[PDB]
């Protein structure tokens, strides 16, 4: 289309070009209508010709087969200088058709005979011979197991002809790179599919050329990578080392030659080639791992493999070393099984050399003048190293290396960056040394709390991180709790060290939560002055969370006054903000109270006065008033709902004193501002109190009182689409009733209008609201099931019956309609679940309903199709069949 002017070259023009794409995608000789006259659109044409001719494979007649070949052969010859990447699209398009043994049925010899000796057939002949055995059994086109049976064994027979063609390609102007890039990609394919299948490459030109090009310093990155990838392809083609006579030996000696070329590329700092070599080296080791482990230093298990990966892992550019990582993990996972102590022992001298190199790579530049950024590119590299150091130390003994690491700290005046790297490594393997008998853990702990403030920020920061891991050793040795907390207070008071210190205190609080009644006051003073320290959000939340969990473990006598002293700091701020007349934002104070109430959950026996009740009753008015002040703001009201949710949970079984005041205020605020978070909070109240018979009536009055304002808001123009949140949270609340007290809802006048609105909301194209409505329908109908006659099921069976008499037909009808006409396929497993549940309550009633639905459905679709679909659903013996039936049926509209 001419109006594509903006597309290639502000969205306001390109938005126009884009619209006509989606119109045309679905449509169908008709694409090749361009080039009425050929003059320099052709990108969009060629790009379209790929995807459409691909789809056309399984659409077109067998009439005009060679037309596709000859049109494509013509086009590709005429479009040689557009782009190297368009050639690939066209080559693939040809090859996935040409492979299919109809048409001219032309097996390998045919392309060879028709094209080979034409000097400019080779660029494209190679391109199609490369992709053809690569897209046998392979993606975008469907796998084609039908055709596969014959072909690979003919390509195994003909591979010699393709190798001989490739030898013609190197004599005929193997002078410059683009031809060899094609030759290597082609050879890599016929390697990859194994189809050489014989000993012969010792008597061949191509394999020597491949390695020569890789040894050259004057070679291009393009050619170097295409050759590197060819060598990897050739290594992967060693499916098993001995399944045919070992061309493996040729590839193995070949790669080992590249060490000189490697060392020279690193001296030149030719990094893209250094990376290409480290890949080849790693894929050699991967390809022969089994031989290395089972026959160490023997034949193709030769340990020069690991020795090359050890020189790579020493390269100062960290991007080089982390190539070799997955091989080290894989070597480790093999050693972790076999348990031959020599097949541990030999390799332990290599694993220690790797672990030394990795530890050296963890050293910061001595330059540095801060803490480590954990989001640096070095910071994130450090994590990958850290996680690999963990695994290989676990094969060696975490005691043995934690021992030797600490030895390095306390000898020969270690510079700061060595000291910090050691503390970093030690923090990775702490939490993996045995705590049942290792007093050396106490040495490091003691020796760290006695480290002076004068050492560089990094050494202090990381020793604070290590002190966190060592929280497990603190719990067993609480004489250290006091010194440890002291060391962490001191770090907490320096901005970059503050967050790391907070993490470690939180670790101490969590791990030692039982043994910290004496230390709660220290935490409480920090918690009081939380904002003075300049912590991250996570760090401040972790510090409160910790104080509250320790508070929950105090003696019941102390909690009331300790809880109020935690909260007061936040309660005062809120009281001041009520006296602030608009603009205020209570969010940060509500969210701190929420963390406190979430985690202050003491264990109280029955009849015992729960110690939070007094604090929550004193606080409730300031939160109640905050909610009413900000009642118009949806966000602040959600921050209130979440604070008040945990405040009532904080009071244990004594919730009853607060539940009616909360439910009242929820109804009052919702009645004026229909924020869906009140429906969601109501759903939490129903879920957690609905099984108590005293709460059931109050909660049903709450549902009835939340429904009137809800329905009025959905009745409005575009009310479903405008309030998908409200639909989601309405059916959440109704489903919690069905789970916790179905009979209470089912006796009520409100279940019928909830089910009427469910049927209407089936039409709303919103994935989470849809998911919520369909769950309500499924769960409501499931309360008509009674697979245990010994249950007191009879009354609910009765009341679901009454409800389904008058709305079961309207339900099945709308469900089928919304599948066919309203909503995309994402609904179908959920509708299938609802239909399946209706059948599992009453199959013959369901049969009638689906029947009268199919009759009511709005000529294209045939009465036979309707009746076949009914048959398919009503006789499915599993829910998944209903899904398939309904999907296939849905495609007809």
């Amino acid at each position: 289309y001419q109006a594509v002017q903006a597309l290639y070259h502000d969205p306001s023009g390109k938005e126009r070009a884009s619209f006509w794409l989606g119109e045309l995608q679905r449509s169908v000789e008709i694409s090749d209508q361009l080039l009425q006259i050929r003059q320099d659109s052709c990108y969009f044409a060629a790009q379209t010709m790929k995807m459409k001719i691909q789809t056309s494979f399984y659409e077109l007649p067998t009439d005009s087969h060679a037309s596709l070949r000859d049109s494509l052969l013509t086009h590709i010859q005429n479009l040689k200088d557009l782009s190297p990447v368009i050639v690939t699209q066209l080559a693939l398009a040809i090859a996935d058709l040409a492979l299919q043994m109809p048409s001219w049925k032309g097996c390998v010899q045919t392309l060879v005979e028709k094209y080979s000796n034409d000097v400019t057939s080779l660029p494209f002949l190679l391109e199609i011979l490369t992709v053809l055995p690569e897209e046998v059994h392979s993606r975008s086109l469907r796998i084609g197991a039908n055709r596969r049976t014959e072909i690979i064994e003919d390509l195994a027979f003909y591979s010699s002809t393709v190798v001989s063609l490739l030898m013609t390609c190197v004599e005929k102007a193997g002078t410059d790179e683009k031809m060899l890039m094609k030759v290597f990609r082609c050879l890599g394919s016929w390697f990859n599919l194994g189809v050489l299948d014989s000993n012969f490459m010792a008597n061949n030109k191509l394999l020597a050329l491949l390695f020569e090009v890789l040894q050259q310093d004057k070679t291009s990155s393009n050619l170097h990578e295409a050759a590197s990838d060819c060598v990897c392809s050739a290594l992967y083609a060693i499916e098993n080392v001995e399944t045919n006579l070992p061309l493996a030996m040729q590839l193995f000696q070949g790669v080992l030659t590249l060490e000189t070329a490697y060392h020279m590329a690193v001296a030149r700092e030719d990094l893209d080639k250094v990376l290409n070599y480290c890949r080849i080296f790693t894929e050699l080791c991967e390809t022969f791992l089994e031989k290395i482990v089972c026959t160490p230093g023997q034949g193709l298990g030769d340990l020069r493999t690991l020795e090359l990966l050890l020189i790579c892992a020493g390269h100062p550019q960290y991007e080089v070393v982390e190539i070799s990582f997955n091989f080290w993990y894989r070597l480790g996972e093999h050693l972790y099984k076999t348990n031959d102590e020599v097949i541990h022992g030999i390799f332990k001298a290599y694993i220690q050399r790797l672990l030394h190199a990795l530890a050296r790579h963890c050293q910061l530049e001595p330059d540095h003048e801060g803490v480590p950024e954990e989001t640096d590119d070095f910071g994130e590299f450090r994590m990958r190293v850290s996680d690999l150091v963990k695994d290989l130390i676990f094969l060696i003994g975490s005691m043995e290396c934690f021992a030797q690491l600490y030895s390095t700290l306390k000898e020969g005046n270690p510079p700061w960056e060595v000291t910090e790297a050691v503390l970093f490594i030690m923090a990775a393997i702490a939490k993996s040394v045995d705590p049942e008998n290792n007093p050396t853990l106490v040495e490091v702990l003691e020796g760290v709390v006695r480290l002076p403030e004068t050492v560089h920020t990094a050494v202090r920061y990381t020793s604070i991180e290590l002190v966190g891991e060592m929280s497990e050793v603190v719990d067993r040795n609480p004489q250290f709790l006091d010194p440890v907390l002291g060391y962490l207070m001191k770090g907490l008071a320096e901005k970059p060290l503050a967050s790391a210190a907070a993490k470690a205190i939180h670790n101490i609080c969590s791990v030692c939560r039982d043994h910290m009644a004496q230390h709660f006051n220290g935490l409480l003073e920090i918690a009081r002055s939380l904002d003075s320290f300049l912590l991250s959000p996570e760090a401040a939340v972790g510090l409160l969370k910790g104080t509250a969990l320790v508070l929950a473990r105090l003696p019941l006598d102390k909690i009331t006054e300790c809880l109020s002293e935690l909260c007061s700091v936040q309660v005062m701020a809120l009281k001041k903000l009520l006296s602030q007349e608009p603009s205020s934002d209570p969010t940060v104070f509500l969210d701190r109270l929420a963390v406190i109430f979430r985690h202050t959950n003491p264990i109280v026996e029955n009849g015992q006065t729960h110690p939070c009740q007094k604090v929550i009753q004193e606080i409730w008015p300031v939160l109640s008033e905050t909610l009413n002040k900000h009642r118009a703001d949806n966000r602040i009201v959600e921050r209130c709902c979440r604070c008040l949710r945990f405040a009532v949970r904080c009071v244990g079984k004594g919730s009853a004193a607060l539940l009616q005041p909360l439910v009242t205020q929820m109804v009052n605020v919702y009645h004026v501002h229909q924020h869906s978070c009140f429906l969601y909070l109501g759903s939490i109240l129903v879920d957690e109190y609905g099984m108590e018979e005293g709460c059931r009536q109050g909660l049903l009055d709450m549902l009835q009182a939340l429904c009137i304002p809800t329905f009025q808001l959905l009745e409005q123009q575009n009310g479903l689409q405008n309030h998908p949140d409200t639909v989601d949270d309405l059916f959440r609340l109704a489903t919690r009733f069905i789970q916790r007290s179905p009979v209470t809802l089912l006796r009520s006048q409100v279940v019928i209008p909830i089910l009427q609105w469910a049927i209407a909301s089936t039409t709303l194209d919103h994935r989470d609201a849809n998911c919520s409505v369909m769950r309500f329908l499924r769960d409501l109908i499931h309360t008509g099931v009674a697979n245990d006659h010994e249950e007191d099921f009879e009354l609910r069976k009765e009341l679901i019956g009454q409800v389904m008499n008058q709305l079961g037909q309207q339900l099945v009808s709308q469900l089928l309609h919304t599948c066919c006409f309203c909503l995309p396929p994402y609904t179908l497993p959920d509708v299938a679940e609802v239909l399946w549940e209706i059948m599992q309550v009453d199959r013959p009633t369901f049969c009638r309903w689906l029947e009268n639905s199919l009759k009511g459905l709005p000529v294209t679709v045939t009465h036979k199709q309707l009746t076949d679909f009914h048959k398919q659903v009503t006789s499915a013996e599993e829910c998944k069949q209903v899904c398939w039936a309904l999907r296939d049926f849905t495609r007809l509209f």
């Binding site: 049903l700 009055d701 006048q749 409100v750």
Partner: peptide
Amino acid sequence: DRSSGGSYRDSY
């Protein structure tokens, strides 16, 4: 008593 549950249900 439960009859009153019907009364507050009725209005609008």
